[PDB]
């Protein structure tokens with residue numbers, strides 16, 4: 005806790021904080037770490053008021069553990085199923101995508117990560133009729149492709165016009181801009197708890213590697229902390245507010261010593277919940293929209309299954 | 320030592336002093352995160368520091384292309400040219416060699432590269448009106464001994480070749496004393512020579528032309544087909560050094576190259592039997608690439624050898640060709656032979 | 660709850676603040692700077708600058724973006740098939756990169772794009788400016804003059820064929836000296852100079868708001884020599900790409916970059932691949948490659964988020980970049 009303010013907890017006065025900060029104990033952490041008896045009798049303060057203040061301070065700052073069954077019945081209805089257009093992951097994901105998890109796609113140049121993001125966003129916005137927020141960091145969005153994708157499913161101008169206005173796009177090219185955008189989204193959705201419509205349910209980040217890649221390198225440590233903080237806030241957003249978050253990434257060394265692995269080192273590997281490794285086919289059948297999709301990490305189903313996805317003829 | 324005059328706050332300059340940063344080149348060498356971790360201070364002040372350092376290093380004049388076009392005397396590199404000594408060759412090259420960048424001359428043996436190099440060495444000492452630069456030249460022999468006898472013969476026959484220039488100032492010109500000759504034997508020796516001896520000659524103003532007798536000769540005796548990376552590193556370093564010197568002192572650099580056959584089983588050579596050596600890494604360092612070819616007795620059964628000088632690529636020259644002959648006076652192009 | 664790590668704070672003030680035990684700006688917002696300075700042992704200047712930087716740090720949807728990109732036009736190339744394959748020319752607000760073997764026509768394309776960006780809106784241009792940054796010294800004014808003369812001849816021909824007064828009204832201003840005064844020239848002989856010029860670009864673009872094109876003719880040369888440390892090169896390249904895309908999106912530009920090809924001995928038959936490693940591969944929005952085939956120049960699109968890859972032929976005439 006910082007400086008004393010009125011309304012933080014009942015029964016606070018300036019004498020209490022003056023004596024406590026004179027006794028080298030101001031913050032809540034060391035006040036609760038120190039024995040209540042020690043500060044109670046050593047400083048001579050009243051025991052009843054002290055214990056009441058400590059209990060009311062912990063209660064208003066804590067998270068009370070809850071039973072499991074009740075939250076299970078509530079999550080039975082809180083969750084949702086989002087389909088993109090292919091069932092390769094759908095069958096291997098307990099027959100439905102999870103709203104409230106951190107899934108991501110790792111793919112190289114020309115793999116089709118942003119194509120998957122675009123088609124998924126179009127399907128979510130048009131078919132299911134919910135607002136969706138898209139974050140771009142390398143100029144990978146073009147509205148003409150969105151219009152072309154929408155036209156492949158509808159032939160009415162009014163539906164195309166209405167669908168576009170529910171897709172919100174914001175440009176962030178530095179990690180601070182991305183953090184500010186996500187914090188603003190968190191604040192706005194926290195203020196919009198009363199409302200039932202207009203709240204975005206799917207959040208897409210076009211490229212998390214490009215923003216944070218310049219921050220890596222050297223022998224320093226602030227880049228790892230920044231990326232960990234970004235991951236933590238993304239996870240808190242997705243869990244607490246029940247949003248589906250999708251991000252992209254790149255691959256690393258393909259040499260003999262190191263297999264094809266996602267970028268951002270080992271620390272980023274623990275962040276996401278689902279991994280989809282897009283790839284291109286070789287030999288006959290190459291080029292076009294023919295891309296091989298695989299599921300590396302799911303933590304819910306067996307992995308190592310390879311499928312086929314076409315984009316050129318899809319939408 | 321130099322950032323003191325920059326406007327700033329005492330904290331950032333104290334951090335710079337504690338971090339042992341010398342000049343603007345040192346601070347521009349490092350990147351954002353490196354400077355952030357060295358100075359241990361916030362990002363916006365780093366951005367301000369970079370902006371101020373960049374504004375100090377450059378960014379004063381708004382130079383448009385009118386200043387490049389109209390102001391002929393302000394930018395000699397864009398208009399002044401080094402004449403080759405023959406009007407036909409100059410017409411083919413639209414004036415002569417550029418004063419910036421590297422110009423390559425490639426071809427098989429007995430094609431006439433050394434004669435052209437000697438003629439360019441002699442032609443640089445003429446006044447600016449006659450297509451010269453009023454300076455000397457540097458010759459670096461990398462393969463064998465310098466041909467002094469041919470140089471003396473060319474110097475003796477010089478009055479006959481320069482028919483247009485009147486001869487009163489020709490006797491004043493001391494051709495022999497304004498040509499410097501160097502010898503090398505290794506790649507490292509050539510690198511040391513270009514790193515140390517050449518800048519001394521160019522800076523003091525003795526010469527304004529650099530000629531390498533055979534750049535490919537040292538590199539073909541050390542590196543095999545399995546050692547491409549060190550050769551590429553050395554070629555990149557040599558090209559960077561040569562380009563920097565040429566840009567700094569406004570002195571043309573002429574490089575003489577050898578060729579290798581196609582050995583048909585790309586780079587623009589489809590039906591050509593020979594191609595310039597040293598691969599594509601060396602080809603990326605050049606500006607104007609020439610090629611001198613000679614058709615053997617099979618096509619030269621007419622009585623005299625057939626020589627053609629061809630332009631391969633250039634930012635401002637179409638692919639063309641002409642013909643020339645070698646005589647006791649020098650290299651002369653055949654009139655009315657340019658191909659379109 | 661906003662962690663202090665997510666703010667551009669100096670490490671010293673951040674570390675002392677978190678040593679004090681504050682982990683949210685919501686309570687830093689109302690603390691008086693006097694006791695704030697007294698508590699954490701700082702002065703007023705750092706307190707006020709931290710407060711302002713914390714407090715300082717739009718809603719555009721797909722329809723607005725579609726309308727905006729329809730308002731602004733495309734940069735003509737004078738190659739009809741190349742315009743058709745690219746969707747109408749070089750797009751704005753995106754980074755375009757061109758690769759190819761030496762002496763293939765990349766500099767000619769850059770010169771043509773510099774000339775073509777000044778076509779009046781009536782004929783179907785963008786009517787903007789151009790910034791040319793040269794790192795190799797291959798900028799010759801004579802070729803630009805010839806290209807501009809050919810362009811003005813073609814423009815006069817089509818204007819006369821149309822027989823429209825409004826077309827004539829946009830030609831007397833379109834003279835050789837006027838268009839050739841709208842190209843701003845720089846020269847960076849070292850990668851440090853190039854980086855410094857890049858840092859100085861935003862103010863220059865703020866001064867001259869009519870610029871709609873930035874050309875960097877050659878980025879491989881400054882970075883492919885005298886740089887043993889690969890990690891530093893990678894960091895510099897990533898930072899440069901991020902800055903360039905930020906400039907393009909902020910000032911509504913069309914960044915043009917030029918690269919180089921490198922032989923790769925795969926299997927046993929060597930083939931040409933773009934340089935600067937594989938991490939750089941997806942640092943550009945659009946990637947173009949110029950082939951040689953057999954005496955025929957081909958412009959093959961490689962990576963783009965809008966159109967499928969195909970192949971188009973072209974050639975260079977004494978008038979510039981042309982089709983057929």
Ligand SMILES: Nc1ncnc2c1ncn2[C@@H]1O[C@H](COP(=O)(O)OP(=O)(O)OP(=O)(O)O)[C@@H](O)[C@H]1O
Nearest residue numbers: 112113114115116118144316941963964965966967
């Ligand atoms: N790192 C990346 N950043 C952005 N986009 C990427 C990335 N990696 C791959 N892509 C996308 O992968 C796609 C694969 O190329 P492809 O030519 O198949 O797409 P396309 O132009 O959308 O095709 P079509 O119009 O035929 O559907 C590219 O369009 C590109 O946008």
Ligand SMILES: Nc1ncnc2c1ncn2[C@@H]1O[C@H](COP(=O)(O)OP(=O)(O)OP(=O)(O)O)[C@@H](O)[C@H]1O
Nearest residue numbers: 427428429430431432433434469532575645646647
């Ligand atoms: N009077 C002459 N004096 C000298 N050479 C003459 C004369 N007349 C004709 N030539 C021709 O000049 C040519 C000189 O060849 P040159 O030394 O230039 O060949 P190169 O292979 O390019 O040289 P280098 O291997 O030294 O680079 C000879 O092939 C010779 O036939």
Ligand SMILES: Nc1ncnc2c1ncn2[C@@H]1O[C@H](COP(=O)(O)OP(=O)(O)O)[C@@H](O)[C@H]1O
Nearest residue numbers: 634635636637638761762763764765766767977
């Ligand atoms: N005035 C001209 N007329 C006709 N063709 C030209 C003219 N100037 C240059 N060219 C051709 O255009 C090409 C330019 O290539 P260039 O831009 O130098 O490639 P790079 O930039 O990769 O070095 C050359 O191959 C040359 O043949």
Ligand SMILES: [Mg+2]
Nearest residue numbers: 431432433434
């Ligand atoms: Mg010779």
Ligand SMILES: [Mg+2]
Nearest residue numbers: 762765766797
């Ligand atoms: Mg070029």
